[PDB]
Amino acid sequence: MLIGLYVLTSGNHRGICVNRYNPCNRKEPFFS
Amino acid sequence: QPEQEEEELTGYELDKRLGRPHPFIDPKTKKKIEKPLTSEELWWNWRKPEKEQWSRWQRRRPDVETVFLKAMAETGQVKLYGDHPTLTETALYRAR
Amino acid sequence: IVDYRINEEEFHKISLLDCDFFIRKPPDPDNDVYDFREMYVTPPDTDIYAIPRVLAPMPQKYIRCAMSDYGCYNVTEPPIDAPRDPMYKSEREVSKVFLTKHYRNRRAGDPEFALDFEEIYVIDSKTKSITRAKVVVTVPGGRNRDRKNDLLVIRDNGTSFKIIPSEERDDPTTVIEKEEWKKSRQDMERHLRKLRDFSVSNWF
Amino acid sequence: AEHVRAPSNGKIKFNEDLVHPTRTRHGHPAFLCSIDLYVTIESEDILHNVNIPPKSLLLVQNDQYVESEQVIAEIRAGISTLNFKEKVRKHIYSDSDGE
Amino acid sequence: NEGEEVALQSPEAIEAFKMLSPNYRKKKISDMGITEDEYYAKQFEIKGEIPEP
Amino acid sequence: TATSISLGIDDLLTIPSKGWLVQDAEQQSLILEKHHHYGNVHAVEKLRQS
């Protein structure tokens, strides 16, 4: 049960892990 | 400041900012070092043996990361210093 | 210490986390006019009045201005001692106040309303000081550039001010993403430096 | 009980007049510090500054190249008398017959 | 003889520390004004009373 | 159940620097053994270093 709760709240990759190149040279869903 | 004109166009600087493959230590700023103490001058505890000694750890460990890095290097997706991947390079791959 | 107790009904009161700042109020219909000639600062919610540190030239005439607050929300979990005691507590915590000149001392109602971003004054909680900002207009158009296509970007804890054209603004995701990338990159290098093969390696 | 290790690869520079000579518990030559010292390692890219204020044993000599993650010195900060002290006897034995 | 993990105070010990280094030995021998071969020979010398001929 | 965690042989990662560290410790230990033999270190001292 603890494993499941941790996975839900663990999160997402933030910088180098999610984008290869700096975001400078160049998330989307919005829900109500 | 009507025209914003800041330009990092040197290959190293541009590559580092963008994130493209590049050498970690700048080739230009690498600096030579005065010779260190010779083996003889050092105290015994720190003196390398004259004949190489056998160990069970003499050969590098086989792994999935090394195989993939080599394969991608041939394709051209990554450029690596050298022809065989290093331990730091393998660590970065696990992350990305 | 001034030694006189003022009538605060005639003063604008601006509250910051560690201080209360008072500036004189000339009478007006919408309450937007300010005199920087008289000012006093007081420890929070206490009434011994004192003179502020002024770090810049101040206006000598009435100016119509707009006020905004800069700061951080603090959410704390407080100890629970009774059956329905609060589970969380949230506080605004303002640290700086920015006052911006209305253009040509014009009024909100007018069709011609804009704000002059060239003149912005800052009040700082920690130092009990009032100063004027340094803006860098990078927007071509010269001094006469239209004030209907102007946006100000404030970064760096309130210490950087720039005016740029409107369409060239960055979306909210890009600002967050850019920051994360910088921090994450620097952190990985710090980890990998310890390894003995770092000099002979390549970022990829 | 803490071992100062090396930040990066390079030559270790320090003044030897300040430190005083000794032999360690494991038999090696070493230097003992009773004043604070600054030791620098000159990696080609950068200079690393490390300090050893408490009585410490420095196990390196000026101009020695030291690789990363190698124990360069020992803090030995703790100075507590032990009531758990126990004297023990080891016996050496002979590997060949003779006089 | 001195103790453990203690600054070496006896004069003989300090010289022994300095001689664990090859350069000190050569520099010192030059001061004594002897050839390299001579140092080797003095090592193999007879201590104690030397008898009369 | 949906994420389905499991453990495999190659998920038991080891720190990148282990080989270098074990190899160096072994060198120090060999050198001390030659020296016990030649008379430059005593026995309580060998035990302790190890």
Side-chain angles (χ1 to χ4, degrees), chain A residues 1-4 6-32, chain B residues 1-3 9 11-29 36-87 89-96, chain C residues 1-22 24-30 32-45 47-74 76 78-111 113-130 132-134 136-138 140-142 146-149 151-172 174-176 178-204, chain D residues 1-34 36-43 45 47-49 51-54 56-78 87-99, chain E residues 1-33 39-41 43-45 47-53, chain F:
Chain A
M1 320 166 45
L2 259 186
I3 291 289
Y6 184 83
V7 168
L8 277 172
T9 59
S10 67
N12 186 232
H13 307 98
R14 288 156 187 90
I16 48 179
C17 301
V18 69
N19 306 310
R20 197 185 173 176
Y21 295 124
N22 207 318
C24 182
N25 37 53
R26 179 76 279 270
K27 209 175 267 181
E28 288 138 352
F30 268 77
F31 289 106
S32 310
Chain B
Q1 301 176 183
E3 303 178 357
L9 31 77
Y12 189 82
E13 294 298 321
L14 186 64
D15 282 5
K16 197 176 180 299
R17 280 184 58 254
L18 307 182
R20 325 179 51 90
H22 76 275
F24 264 126
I25 296 298
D26 189 46
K28 184 187 76 271
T29 68
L37 283 181
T38 58
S39 64
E40 311 291 332
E41 251 293 311
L42 297 178
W43 285 324
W44 87 77
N45 43 358
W46 292 109
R47 207 182 310 178
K48 239 201 58 60
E50 311 289 334
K51 277 154 43 182
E52 196 174 7
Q53 305 288 138
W54 186 88
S55 176
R56 262 227 160 181
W57 303 92
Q58 61 187 14
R59 305 172 74 203
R60 207 170 168 269
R61 193 205 190 268
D63 216 3
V64 195
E65 311 152 35
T66 306
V67 178
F68 278 75
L69 274 178
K70 285 174 163 299
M72 59 187 70
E74 306 172 6
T75 313
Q77 203 170 178
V78 292
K79 295 181 182 304
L80 309 168
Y81 198 116
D83 38 39
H84 197 93
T86 203
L87 290 163
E89 285 166 6
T90 56
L92 194 74
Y93 183 82
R94 211 186 300 146
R96 309 185 107 219
Chain C
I1 40 180
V2 278
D3 297 353
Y4 48 88
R5 39 152 45 97
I6 52 182
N7 180 21
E8 288 188 331
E9 199 256 351
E10 300 288 338
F11 270 77
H12 287 279
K13 176 179 181 179
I14 308 188
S15 52
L16 282 310
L17 185 73
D18 296 333
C19 59
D20 286 338
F21 221 86
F22 301 98
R24 162 159 294 275
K25 70 164 59 177
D28 66 304
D30 213 16
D32 297 345
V33 181
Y34 296 82
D35 291 5
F36 279 60
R37 180 59 198 174
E38 304 184 14
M39 37 186 52
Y40 309 97
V41 55
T42 321
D45 212 4
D47 259 18
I48 316 176
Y49 310 101
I51 296 279
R53 307 162 47 94
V54 184
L55 305 183
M58 283 303 145
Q60 307 295 324
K61 204 183 177 60
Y62 294 6
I63 38 177
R64 199 182 299 264
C65 289
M67 87 160 81
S68 300
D69 58 306
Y70 198 72
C72 32
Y73 292 92
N74 189 25
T76 109
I80 308 186
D81 274 8
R84 54 202 69 88
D85 193 80
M87 283 201 74
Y88 67 96
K89 179 185 181 181
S90 177
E91 299 299 318
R92 170 72 205 189
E93 207 177 350
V94 280
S95 173
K96 288 179 189 296
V97 161
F98 305 128
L99 282 143
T100 279
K101 201 188 182 179
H102 287 200
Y103 196 42
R104 214 177 301 270
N105 293 10
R106 281 164 169 173
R107 195 190 298 266
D110 303 342
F113 178 60
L115 296 162
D116 184 276
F117 286 124
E118 276 197 354
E119 190 161 327
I120 299 181
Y121 295 108
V122 315
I123 305 181
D124 185 31
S125 60
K126 199 58 189 60
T127 57
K128 298 96 184 172
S129 67
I130 187 164
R132 190 198 213 265
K134 309 173 186 178
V136 183
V137 201
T138 63
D146 74 309
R147 312 272 189 171
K148 275 293 109 183
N149 193 73
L151 177 92
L152 179 83
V153 183
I154 315 175
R155 310 182 87 260
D156 218 15
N157 217 4
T159 61
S160 300
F161 292 89
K162 272 164 42 67
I163 321 175
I164 65 176
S166 174
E167 199 70 26
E168 316 173 1
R169 51 140 61 87
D170 290 352
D171 53 283
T174 304
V175 319
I176 309 168
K178 278 176 50 62
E179 193 161 341
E180 297 290 327
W181 212 93
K182 191 194 61 61
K183 302 194 306 292
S184 58
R185 235 228 93 154
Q186 297 300 135
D187 289 345
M188 192 81 182
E189 318 158 26
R190 201 185 329 268
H191 196 59
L192 299 176
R193 197 176 302 267
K194 63 185 51 179
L195 303 184
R196 316 221 277 243
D197 290 350
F198 193 76
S199 184
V200 295
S201 311
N202 202 283
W203 209 69
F204 57 79
Chain D
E2 203 269 345
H3 299 107
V4 179
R5 285 182 191 254
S8 71
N9 294 359
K11 309 158 39 179
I12 301 188
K13 297 179 60 181
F14 72 101
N15 208 351
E16 297 190 341
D17 67 336
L18 306 174
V19 300
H20 292 285
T22 187
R23 163 183 252 251
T24 326
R25 59 162 45 180
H26 304 314
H28 297 144
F31 288 123
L32 169 59
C33 309
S34 56
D36 65 315
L37 187 64
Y38 283 98
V39 287
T40 50
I41 304 196
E42 195 193 4
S43 83
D45 188 44
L47 261 161
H48 304 260
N49 204 191
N51 60 332
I52 33 184
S56 172
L57 233 39
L58 193 44
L59 321 161
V60 287
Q61 248 181 349
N62 196 349
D63 211 14
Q64 187 177 344
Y65 188 95
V66 298
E67 287 181 1
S68 197
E69 64 218 346
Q70 262 196 8
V71 185
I72 297 319
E74 212 281 300
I75 301 294
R76 213 194 339 174
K87 281 289 191 179
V88 211
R89 305 197 305 106
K90 200 164 60 173
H91 295 243
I92 309 196
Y93 289 140
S94 174
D95 70 279
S96 292
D97 297 34
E99 312 176 9
Chain E
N1 290 328
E2 301 203 35
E4 202 64 46
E5 283 187 10
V6 65
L8 293 175
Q9 299 296 327
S10 303
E12 51 269 359
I14 309 175
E15 197 77 7
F17 189 91
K18 294 172 153 49
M19 287 228 299
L20 278 169
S21 295
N23 295 152
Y24 191 95
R25 277 177 279 184
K26 55 182 300 179
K27 170 249 168 183
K28 212 55 199 58
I29 206 200
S30 306
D31 188 37
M32 306 305 293
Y39 191 62
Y40 290 148
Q43 299 163 187
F44 311 112
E45 213 66 33
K47 51 181 60 64
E49 191 264 342
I50 34 180
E52 297 90 14
Chain F
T1 308
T3 49
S4 75
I5 199 171
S6 61
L7 200 55
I9 309 161
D10 63 317
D11 197 86
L12 298 165
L13 316 172
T14 308
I15 35 260
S17 42
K18 188 192 193 298
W20 292 325
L21 259 12
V22 181
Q23 217 170 177
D24 73 56
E26 65 198 341
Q27 172 178 145
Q28 300 270 343
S29 303
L30 293 179
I31 286 164
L32 211 71
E33 296 166 352
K34 290 178 46 182
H35 296 260
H36 190 42
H37 294 329
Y38 301 168
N40 322 144
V41 282
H42 72 261
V44 353
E45 279 169 359
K46 185 181 176 177
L47 167 79
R48 286 166 163 165
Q49 199 238 13
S50 175

Coordinates of all heavy atoms in Angstrom, one line a residue, chain D residues 21-25 29-32 57 61 76, chain E residues 3-9 14 17-18 20-21:
Chain D
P21 N 57.0 16.2 12.5 CA 57.1 14.8 12.2 C 56.7 13.6 13.1 O 56.8 13.8 14.3 CB 58.6 14.7 11.9 CG 59.0 16.0 11.4 CD 58.2 16.9 12.3
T22 N 56.1 12.5 12.6 CA 55.6 11.4 13.4 C 55.5 10.0 12.8 O 55.7 9.9 11.6 CB 54.2 11.7 13.9 OG1 53.8 10.6 14.9 CG2 53.2 11.7 12.8
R23 N 55.3 8.9 13.5 CA 55.0 7.6 12.9 C 53.6 7.1 13.3 O 53.3 7.1 14.5 CB 55.9 6.5 13.4 CG 55.5 5.1 13.2 CD 56.5 4.1 13.8 NE 57.2 3.5 12.7 CZ 57.1 2.2 12.4 NH1 56.2 1.4 13.0 NH2 57.8 1.7 11.4
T24 N 52.8 6.7 12.3 CA 51.5 6.3 12.6 C 51.2 5.0 13.2 O 52.1 4.2 13.3 CB 50.7 6.4 11.2 OG1 51.3 7.5 10.5 CG2 49.3 6.7 11.4
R25 N 50.0 4.7 13.6 CA 49.7 3.4 14.2 C 49.8 2.2 13.4 O 49.7 1.1 13.9 CB 48.3 3.5 14.8 CG 47.2 3.9 13.9 CD 45.9 3.5 14.5 NE 45.8 4.0 15.9 CZ 44.7 3.8 16.7 NH1 43.6 3.2 16.2 NH2 44.7 4.2 17.9
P29 N 55.2 6.7 7.7 CA 55.6 8.0 8.0 C 54.5 9.0 7.9 O 53.7 8.9 7.0 CB 56.7 8.2 7.0 CG 56.9 7.0 6.2 CD 55.6 6.2 6.4
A30 N 54.4 10.1 8.7 CA 53.4 11.1 8.6 C 53.7 12.3 9.3 O 54.7 12.4 10.0 CB 52.1 10.5 9.1
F31 N 52.9 13.4 9.2 CA 53.1 14.7 9.9 C 51.9 15.0 10.7 O 50.8 14.8 10.4 CB 53.2 15.8 8.8 CG 54.4 15.8 8.0 CD1 54.3 15.8 6.7 CD2 55.6 16.0 8.6 CE1 55.4 15.9 5.9 CE2 56.8 16.1 7.8 CZ 56.7 16.0 6.5
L32 N 52.1 15.6 11.9 CA 51.1 15.9 12.9 C 50.8 17.4 13.0 O 51.8 18.2 13.1 CB 51.4 15.4 14.3 CG 50.6 15.8 15.5 CD1 49.1 15.4 15.4 CD2 51.2 15.1 16.7
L57 N 46.5 14.0 11.4 CA 47.7 13.4 10.8 C 47.6 13.6 9.3 O 46.6 13.2 8.6 CB 47.7 11.9 11.1 CG 49.0 11.4 11.7 CD1 49.5 12.4 12.7 CD2 48.7 10.1 12.4
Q61 N 53.1 14.5 1.2 CA 54.2 15.3 1.2 C 54.1 16.4 0.1 O 53.4 16.1 -0.8 CB 55.4 14.5 0.9 CG 56.4 14.3 2.0 CD 57.6 13.4 1.5 OE1 57.5 12.8 0.4 NE2 58.6 13.3 2.3
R76 N 40.7 12.7 13.5 CA 40.8 12.2 14.8 C 40.3 13.2 15.8 O 40.9 13.5 16.9 CB 42.3 12.0 15.1 CG 42.6 10.8 16.0 CD 44.1 10.9 16.5 NE 44.8 11.7 15.5 CZ 46.1 12.0 15.7 NH1 46.8 11.6 16.8 NH2 46.7 12.7 14.8
Chain E
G3 N 57.2 6.5 21.4 CA 55.7 6.5 21.7 C 55.0 6.4 20.5 O 55.5 6.1 19.4
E4 N 53.6 6.5 20.5 CA 52.8 6.4 19.3 C 52.1 7.6 19.0 O 51.5 8.2 19.8 CB 51.8 5.3 19.6 CG 51.3 4.6 18.3 CD 52.4 3.9 17.5 OE1 53.1 3.2 18.1 OE2 52.4 4.1 16.3
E5 N 52.1 8.0 17.7 CA 51.5 9.1 17.3 C 51.8 10.4 18.1 O 51.0 11.1 18.5 CB 50.0 8.9 17.1 CG 49.6 8.1 15.9 CD 48.1 8.0 15.6 OE1 47.4 8.7 16.3 OE2 47.7 7.3 14.7
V6 N 53.1 10.6 18.3 CA 53.6 11.7 19.0 C 54.7 12.3 18.3 O 55.3 11.7 17.5 CB 54.1 11.2 20.4 CG1 55.3 10.3 20.3 CG2 54.3 12.4 21.3
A7 N 54.9 13.6 18.4 CA 55.9 14.3 17.7 C 57.1 13.8 18.1 O 57.4 13.6 19.3 CB 55.8 15.8 18.0
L8 N 58.0 13.5 17.1 CA 59.2 12.9 17.4 C 60.2 13.9 17.9 O 60.4 14.9 17.3 CB 59.8 12.3 16.2 CG 59.0 11.1 15.5 CD1 59.8 10.8 14.2 CD2 59.0 9.9 16.4
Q9 N 60.7 13.7 19.1 CA 61.6 14.7 19.7 C 63.0 14.3 19.8 O 63.9 15.2 19.7 CB 61.1 15.0 21.1 CG 59.7 15.6 21.2 CD 59.6 16.9 20.5 OE1 60.5 17.7 20.5 NE2 58.4 17.2 19.9
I14 N 64.7 12.2 14.3 CA 64.4 13.2 13.3 C 65.3 13.0 12.1 O 64.9 13.1 11.0 CB 64.4 14.6 13.8 CG1 63.5 14.7 15.0 CG2 64.0 15.6 12.7 CD1 63.5 16.1 15.7
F17 N 64.0 10.2 10.0 CA 62.8 10.7 9.1 C 63.3 11.3 7.9 O 62.7 11.1 6.8 CB 61.9 11.6 9.9 CG 60.6 11.9 9.3 CD1 59.5 11.1 9.5 CD2 60.5 13.0 8.5 CE1 58.3 11.4 8.9 CE2 59.3 13.4 7.9 CZ 58.2 12.6 8.1
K18 N 64.3 12.2 8.0 CA 64.7 12.9 6.9 C 65.4 12.1 5.8 O 65.5 12.5 4.7 CB 65.6 14.1 7.4 CG 64.8 15.1 8.2 CD 65.8 16.1 8.8 CE 65.1 17.4 9.0 NZ 63.8 17.3 9.7
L20 N 64.6 9.1 4.8 CA 63.8 8.2 4.1 C 63.6 8.7 2.7 O 62.9 8.1 1.9 CB 62.5 8.1 4.9 CG 62.3 7.2 6.1 CD1 61.0 7.6 6.7 CD2 62.3 5.8 5.7
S21 N 64.2 9.9 2.5 CA 64.1 10.5 1.2 C 65.4 10.4 0.4 O 66.5 10.7 1.0 CB 63.8 12.0 1.3 OG 62.5 12.1 1.9

